[PDB]
Amino acid sequence: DNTVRVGVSRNTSGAAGQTLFRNFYLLRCNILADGRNATKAVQSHFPFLSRAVRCLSPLAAHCADRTLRRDNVKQILTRELPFSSDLINYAHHVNSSSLTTSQGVEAARLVAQVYGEQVPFDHIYPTGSATYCPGAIANAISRIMAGFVPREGDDFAPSGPIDYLAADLIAYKFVLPYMLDMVDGRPQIVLPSHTVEEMLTNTSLLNSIDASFGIEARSDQRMTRDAAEMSSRSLNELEDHDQRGRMPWKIMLGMMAAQLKVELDALADERTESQANAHVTSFGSRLFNQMSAFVTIDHELMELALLIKEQGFAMNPGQIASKWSLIRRSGPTRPLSGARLEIRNGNWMIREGDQTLLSVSPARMA
Amino acid sequence: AGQTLFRNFYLLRCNILADGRNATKAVQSHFPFLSRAVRCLSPLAAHCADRTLRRDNVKQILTRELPFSSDLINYAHHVNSSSLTTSQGVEAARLVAQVYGEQVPFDHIYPTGSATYCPGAIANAISRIMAGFVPREGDDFAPSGPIDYLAADLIAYKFVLPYMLDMVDGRPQIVLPSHTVEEMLTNTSLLNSIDASFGIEARSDQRMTRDAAEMSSRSLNELEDHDQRGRMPWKIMLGMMAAQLKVELDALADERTESQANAHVTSFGSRLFNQMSAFVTIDHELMELALLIKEQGFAMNPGQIASKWSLIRRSGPTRPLSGARLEIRNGNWMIREGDQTLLSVSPARMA
Amino acid sequence: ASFGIEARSDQRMTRDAAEMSSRSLNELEDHDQRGRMPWKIMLGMMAAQLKV
Amino acid sequence: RVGVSRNTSGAAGQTLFRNFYLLRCNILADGRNATKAVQSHFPFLSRAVRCLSPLAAHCADRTLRRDNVKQILTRELPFSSDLINYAHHVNSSSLTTSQGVEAARLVAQVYGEQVPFDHIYPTGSATYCPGAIANAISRIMAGFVPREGDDFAPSGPIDYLAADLIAYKFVLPYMLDMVDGRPQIVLPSHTVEEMLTNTSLLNSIDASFGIEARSDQRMTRDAAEMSSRSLNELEDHDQRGRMPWKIMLGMMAAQLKVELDALADERTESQANAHVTSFGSRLFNQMSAFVTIDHELMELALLIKEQGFAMNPGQIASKWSLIRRSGPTRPLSGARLEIRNGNWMIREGDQTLLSVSPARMA
Numbered sequence A: 001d002n003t004v005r006v007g008v009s010r011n012t013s014g015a016a017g018q019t020l021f022r023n024f025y026l027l028r029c030n031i032l033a034d035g036r037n038a039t040k041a042v043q044s045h046f047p048f049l050s051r052a053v054r055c056l057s058p059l060a061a062h063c064a065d066r067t068l069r070r071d072n073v074k075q076i077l078t079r080e081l082p083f084s085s086d087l088i089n090y091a092h093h094v095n096s097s098s099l100t101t102s103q104g105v106e107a108a109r110l111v112a113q114v115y116g117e118q119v120p121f122d123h124i125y126p127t128g129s130a131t132y133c134p135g136a137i138a139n140a141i142s143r144i145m146a147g148f149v150p151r152e153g154d155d156f157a158p159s160g161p162i163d164y165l166a167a168d169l170i171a172y173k174f175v176l177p178y179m180l181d182m183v184d185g186r187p188q189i190v191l192p193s194h195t196v197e198e199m200l201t202n203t204s205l206l207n208s209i210d211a212s213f214g215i216e217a218r219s220d221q222r223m224t225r226d227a228a229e230m231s232s233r234s235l236n237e238l239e240d241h242d243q244r245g246r247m248p249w250k251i252m253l254g255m256m257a258a259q260l261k262v263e264l265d266a267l268a269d270e271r272t273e274s275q276a277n278a279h280v281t282s283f284g285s286r287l288f289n290q291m292s293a294f295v296t297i298d299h300e301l302m303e304l305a306l307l308i309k310e311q312g313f314a315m316n317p318g319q320i321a322s323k324w325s326l327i328r329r330s331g332p333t334r335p336l337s338g339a340r341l342e343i344r345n346g347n348w349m350i351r352e353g354d355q356t357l358l359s360v361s362p363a364r365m366a
Numbered sequence B: 001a002g003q004t005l006f007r008n009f010y011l012l013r014c015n016i017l018a019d020g021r022n023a024t025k026a027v028q029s030h031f032p033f034l035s036r037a038v039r040c041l042s043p044l045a046a047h048c049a050d051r052t053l054r055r056d057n058v059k060q061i062l063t064r065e066l067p068f069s070s071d072l073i074n075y076a077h078h079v080n081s082s083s084l085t086t087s088q089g090v091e092a093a094r095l096v097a098q099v100y101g102e103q104v105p106f107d108h109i110y111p112t113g114s115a116t117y118c119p120g121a122i123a124n125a126i127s128r129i130m131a132g133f134v135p136r137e138g139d140d141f142a143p144s145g146p147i148d149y150l151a152a153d154l155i156a157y158k159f160v161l162p163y164m165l166d167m168v169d170g171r172p173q174i175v176l177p178s179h180t181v182e183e184m185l186t187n188t189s190l191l192n193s194i195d196a197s198f199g200i201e202a203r204s205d206q207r208m209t210r211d212a213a214e215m216s217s218r219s220l221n222e223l224e225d226h227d228q229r230g231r232m233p234w235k236i237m238l239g240m241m242a243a244q245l246k247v248e249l250d251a252l253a254d255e256r257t258e259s260q261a262n263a264h265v266t267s268f269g270s271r272l273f274n275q276m277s278a279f280v281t282i283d284h285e286l287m288e289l290a291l292l293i294k295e296q297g298f299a300m301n302p303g304q305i306a307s308k309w310s311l312i313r314r315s316g317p318t319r320p321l322s323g324a325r326l327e328i329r330n331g332n333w334m335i336r337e338g339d340q341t342l343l344s345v346s347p348a349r350m351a
Numbered sequence C: 001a002s003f004g005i006e007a008r009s010d011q012r013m014t015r016d017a018a019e020m021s022s023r024s025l026n027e028l029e030d031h032d033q034r035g036r037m038p039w040k041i042m043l044g045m046m047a048a049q050l051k052v
Numbered sequence D: 001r002v003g004v005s006r007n008t009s010g011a012a013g014q015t016l017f018r019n020f021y022l023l024r025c026n027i028l029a030d031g032r033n034a035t036k037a038v039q040s041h042f043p044f045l046s047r048a049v050r051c052l053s054p055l056a057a058h059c060a061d062r063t064l065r066r067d068n069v070k071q072i073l074t075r076e077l078p079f080s081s082d083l084i085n086y087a088h089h090v091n092s093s094s095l096t097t098s099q100g101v102e103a104a105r106l107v108a109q110v111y112g113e114q115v116p117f118d119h120i121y122p123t124g125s126a127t128y129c130p131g132a133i134a135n136a137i138s139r140i141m142a143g144f145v146p147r148e149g150d151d152f153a154p155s156g157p158i159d160y161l162a163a164d165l166i167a168y169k170f171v172l173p174y175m176l177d178m179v180d181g182r183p184q185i186v187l188p189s190h191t192v193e194e195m196l197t198n199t200s201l202l203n204s205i206d207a208s209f210g211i212e213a214r215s216d217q218r219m220t221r222d223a224a225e226m227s228s229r230s231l232n233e234l235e236d237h238d239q240r241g242r243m244p245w246k247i248m249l250g251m252m253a254a255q256l257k258v259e260l261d262a263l264a265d266e267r268t269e270s271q272a273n274a275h276v277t278s279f280g281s282r283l284f285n286q287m288s289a290f291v292t293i294d295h296e297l298m299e300l301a302l303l304i305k306e307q308g309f310a311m312n313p314g315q316i317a318s319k320w321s322l323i324r325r326s327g328p329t330r331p332l333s334g335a336r337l338e339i340r341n342g343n344w345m346i347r348e349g350d351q352t353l354l355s356v357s358p359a360r361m362a
Helices: A047-054 A057-062 A074-076 A085-087 A105-118 A134-143 A166-170 A196-201 A203-208 A248-268 A271-278 A282-293 A299-310 A317-330 B034-039 B043-047 B059-063 B069-074 B090-103 B119-130 B181-186 B188-194 B230-252 B256-261 B267-275 B277-281 B284-296 B302-315 C038-052 D042-049 D052-059 D080-083 D101-111 D130-142 D160-165 D193-199 D197-204 D223-227 D244-263 D267-272 D278-286 D295-306 D313-326
Strands: A019-020 A029-032 A044-045 A174-178 A209-215 A233-234 A339-346 A349-351 A353-362 B016-017 B028-029 B159-167 B195-199 B325-329 B332-337 B340-345 C002-004 C023-024 D170-176 D205-210 D337-338 D344-348 D351-358
Touching: A019 B090, A019 D337, A029 A282, A029 B090, A044 A282, A044 B267, A044 D244, A047 A174, A047 A248, A047 A282, A057 A166, A057 D278, A085 D101, A105 A134, A105 A196, A166 A353, A174 B325, A196 A203, A196 A248, A203 A248, A203 B332, A248 A299, A248 A317, A248 B284, A248 D130, A271 A317, A282 A317, A282 A349, A299 A317, A299 A353, A353 B043, A353 B340, B034 B230, B034 B267, B043 B119, B090 B119, B090 B181, B090 B195, B090 B230, B119 B230, B181 B188, B181 B230, B188 B230, B188 D337, B195 C023, B230 B256, B230 B302, B256 B302, B256 D042, B267 B277, B267 B284, B267 B302, B277 B284, B325 D197, D042 D052, D042 D080, D052 D130, D052 D160, D080 D130, D101 D130, D101 D193, D101 D244, D130 D160, D130 D197, D130 D244, D160 D193, D160 D205, D193 D197, D193 D244, D197 D205, D205 D244, D244 D313, D267 D313, D278 D295, D278 D313, D295 D313
Parallel strands: none
Antiparallel strands: A019 A029, A029 A044, A174 A209, A209 A233, A339 A349, A349 A353, B016 B028, B159 B195, B325 B332, B332 B340, C002 C023, D170 D205, D337 D344, D344 D351
16 A cells, blocks of 8 residues: 565675775775685775776766765765865865875966866865875866866866867777877887876976777677777877867876876885785785776886786785885886887787787776 | 668668568568667767767768758758658747757758758757757768767766656646647647656666666756756757657658558567657657557558558547556556556667 | 565675665555565564563 | 877677577676687576576565566567576477477376466477476466466465475485385486386485585584485475476476487587587586486586586587487496485496586575
């Protein structure tokens, strides 16, 4: 006669787990015990880094948030103990030294100038301050590209104009960012010479960055003769337009890489956490996969990836933090002159003679 | 392989494959451009791929001695054939041309003030403008226009279920369609009675159903109003597709010779009924045709469709449905009388 | 009362269409053999036992 | 301009053996293997083996999955895969057989008070679809009521055995004949078709049911036998349908055998996917329930084990045809069966020729 229907739990609680580096944004980690299998090598996952690489197509990533996810974001942001992860998630600036950096603030000022006219940008990038959070700027410049407009203390509002590139990136799923140079008087993909912060300081260098976008068609046997050449476009090939946010996209990529590098530097000070979680050997293996978008851009990240692949993806947090600090202090550590660059089957790989030192596949803009 | 039937039609340009094994004429049927019509309800997702890819010239078609309408309807050009065009609800073309105004060369889409128009071209123009294109006078589209707020919102969804609303017992309530789509076009203010929910394609375990998401107040009407968020153009395009289907069914009814010379395709109506499931909840006549096909038990043929459609159009409401009732059950629209299910349709696929 | 499944394995997702995959006691089809009234009586009886 | 377009992808999916009932399988490559590490699984066969606990299998469908089935059951060319799942007779010679029709007639006589005849079993028909009969008896045991061209109506009475089997997760069929004056497990003496032809022999067949206890991390002691129970050990009652349960098991086995025989005609399809050597591996993995009841399934399992637990569908079809034509290809008198650690296996002294473990049903 009278009926009201209510839900029930999707219980899978047997897979107990916990999180590492809760005060970090990208290097925040979730570790899960092997449930389906008996082995005990704890598998791990960096959620926010996955989200960041997904957000390279801002509209596809943020469309679901336009309608139904009007949560109690005010309580989260107005909470007396805010988390840097949440604040950076909603593009709110944070003053933490570990999260913030001073190098390459010129790009941040450029972004604020471009978008500050039609958006309240003081809370994203306070004017004049040298220190800034690249993650917050990346989140802001993705959200604004996806038609949102920030509300400085509460949430975003889906009311702003939508960028042309954010719409063009709905037809693509796979992205391969890579450096480019005018060697031989001809465009050629080259190894990443400059670091991210150098480009952020001198924004003119960003014009060298390039990326290729690819579809996810529903037929097997790609590369028939070549599927990419009529199923894939390059970022710099798109027609110029004032509303088309190319430089914002490049700055978003660079800022995200800068945030990754900053958090890797700050990781060296988490001695207690690294020591306590030395048993998680999947940290290096997971990071080697999730980082793959940024390897082709930054020198130090590429060298870290090479070092990771050398010793079989076994590093715990401290074992990789120490190596990162070593390479940061000592600059270059190995000679890449013998190594050479090669592209085949849509993969960006480094060859030393016959051996492939490193090989990365395009990430997925889910 | 296969063959195309009713080549001059647009939605009923059925593709036929002789994949059956009961007999040589045991043929599987598919309707090209009808899938496209129902797909274009999410214009951005439908047209995102074309934003950076090949373009073709329609000017060659105008010089053809006997040009084929389908390309013109695809690219929103006014075909002059009386079978495809119609005059009922032409004020809808006038008002949409006015609201989009001179920002687009809309004369090629709809002649100024004419009492004749082709609904397919109007709907195609609405969809592609809403996606962020702008037709040129050279009969090709440019992606340089601004992008609608609503079109960028349908990316998050893949299923749609239109339905009419009425203020029954002083509260909003789903009701049977009490109007016809041409009347909706004429009475533009009446379109506000239309509403639609959107789905998300949940997972399955030997289950072919799909999730329609919020059955509560999260339908199209609940979206916050804005200058760019064109709900009304979307409803216009939906009604325009419905009118196109109705007038093409009328044209098929007039195609007595072809229908009776090809009255052997028993899968024709069976495919058509499921392919048009979106429009049953909007129109008297489409509902009546669907109910007659279902009670007939499918296996319907073109000539029988022609005869039945002519009867329905000439006789007005053929049957009374006051004894039946309408219920939305598990994300499905179903017409039930007593305990039996007179008719049922699941949400269509936007993309 | 509202009944629902302990859905398939899934490590994070909080719902499996929780409203679609659940049913209520008063919504089940009626039949003489169904002890709906005995079931509700049993529930109330257990509650009364706890209270006493 | 600078740069050039480089990469794309073509991820998709596929399946195979659509026309078959149990031999339908999902061809999918390994997610972690970029190469053509093809994988196969049998949904229909898994459902069939799981159905041995009828109430456990059909509990959800009693309220939840009430769907529109009339459209499915009213196609110009309806697929036998789901039509047999809803237990409707079909004329497919490749999916029907005449042997054991007396068992179908016996089931019809047993349940005629509720089941309409012609939609489930046309009276006097030489051939019949044993899979449809198995599905129907399972659903009847669950409490459902069939309707021609319509979804089952959950209104029939519950079978006592269906209620009992909900507590047990693991099953293990086997055959027995009198030896030494005491009952003892024996290798099969007749084929499933010969079994169904002479229903009186069905007292020979038996199965043992076992619980699943994930609560304790401790291994299984001798108490595993204390927990378990056997089909004929249960208290006798009119509504407790041991005989229909045995008929269901035999009918499902016969359906598998006849469709395996029909599989011999898929030369083109089988050779088109000869790369999938794991087909036979998956077949043997999911076939532990029925091998212990028939000669020829035992022969096929022994051949697959000897052949390395890996062969393509064409190899399976050809070798099964060879088994069917030859009959008993080996004298198994040398080997002996054992119940070592619960599993059902046969050994030629020390070496084990074939090993089987209890199947999970609920």
